[PDB]
Design a protein around this ligand. Sequence first.
Ligand SMILES: C[C@@H](c1c[nH]c2ccccc12)[C@@H](NC(=O)N1CCC(n2c(=O)[nH]c3ccccc32)CC1)C(=O)N[C@@H](CCCCN)C(=O)OC(C)(C)C
Length: 476
Amino acid sequence: YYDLTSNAVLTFIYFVVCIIGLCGNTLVIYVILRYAKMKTITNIYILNLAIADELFMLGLPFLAMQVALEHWPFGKAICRVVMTVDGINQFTSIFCLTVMSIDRYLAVVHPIKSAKWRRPRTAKMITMAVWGVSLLVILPIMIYAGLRSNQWGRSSCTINWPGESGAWYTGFIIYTFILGFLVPLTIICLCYLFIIIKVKSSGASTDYWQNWTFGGGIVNAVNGSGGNYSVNWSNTGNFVVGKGWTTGSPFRTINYNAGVWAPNGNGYLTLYGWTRSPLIEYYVVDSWGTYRPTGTYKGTVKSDGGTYDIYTTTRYNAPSIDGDDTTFTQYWSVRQSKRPTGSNATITFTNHVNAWKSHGMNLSNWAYQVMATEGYQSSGSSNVTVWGSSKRKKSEKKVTRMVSIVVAVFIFCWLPFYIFNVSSVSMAISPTPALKGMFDFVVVLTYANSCANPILYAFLDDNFKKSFQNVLCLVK
Ligand SMILES: C[C@@H](c1c[nH]c2ccccc12)[C@@H](NC(=O)N1CCC(n2c(=O)[nH]c3ccccc32)CC1)C(=O)N[C@@H](CCCCN)C(=O)OC(C)(C)C
């Protein structure tokens, strides 16, 4: 009914967590406070999370003695103090995360309007509020923290039942679960749902998947991660495979990377699209296999470091997007040599479209445009990644990503705890070695959340990584 070894290893784990968390959080406070580079709005919130996590670790020694002994040695007064400091830091931790996500939501979705809300001085007022609000929310712990006898004949520091009624303890569980966990997370996740809706709503990412085969041979096409796709084809008839946009527009730039462009015979690596009113079919060909497409020569365009020929053809009794035996016109621009592949590359489409209307080639009802692999009576392989361009900087994409991962780790560490607590309300007082270790574990997992954050910043933020290596990496 008691496992001294299983108790000792858990007391050891408490102490390891305390150390790892005080190192990393001290490191995070130092680099933000010392270096000019780190003075960013987001880092005002991280600093406060770091100060909260730092103070959180300071209570761990006291609590480890209670894990090892199932006894509180330091009297009633220090019990109230530790429970009160512990609580303030618990709730300032998650309220900081909440405000931080609200800040990310404002930056992505309403950047122009909240130029005034994202000044350093008001983020400093916001964080002072966060500490104030926490102090109010933990007033119950303040009042009712105390000592309780246990079955071993010892005293535990816990929260005493107010008025000795299991009803008020139960209400306090519900209170802490709603304010400390459910309401912040609901705010954070709605914020991030609006962020990801918004981003996809821009043109930064592709939103269409083309995988059309007429039917002969094998066209093995993988719809990969994000804007990436691959195709393996052999002894085919006509096929076209690519990624792009469900509605095309003549002002969009297109970026791509042909990690593989390995045609064995006729296959075009090209941008491809249709229109209606009138029904035309357009191409900007950057590379090909054993055959270069052609038509009536009308001119040239220079773009993206290469020169293209302009061509036109006219199909009749030919397959379209409208019907199978229809008539339509094709507008080609075809590079003069094969553009190299294996590195990022642009197609500034409003260049090509303007030059066509010059030569009388003019495209109303827009249809899809994709960066495609086309083939005919050939074999080969390609691998391509496709993406627009954005108005928001890669540095702020990286910060916004990082907070989301910090939020996902928070959930992983604090959910077992709240699930146990909601259980405990249900008369679970059968203290057992199996459930008593379960409790000690599920609690130390909330503390280990403060160790993960500094490590998270080192792998997901370059400036935190550069600052850390500045301290930890020795030169001469
Ligand atoms: C009220 C909780 C709290 C205090 N402050 C809060 C602030 C917000 C939300 C809840 C709190 C506090 N719960 C408790 O006291 N009990 C006592 C009774 C326990 N029980 C049963 O009823 N049947 C059992 C059968 C087998 C085993 C245990 C059993 C479970 C719940 C707590 O979780 N205290 C932590 C400190 C962690 C505080 C988080 N920062 C603790 O004591 O951790 C050590 C010292 C390792 C034990």
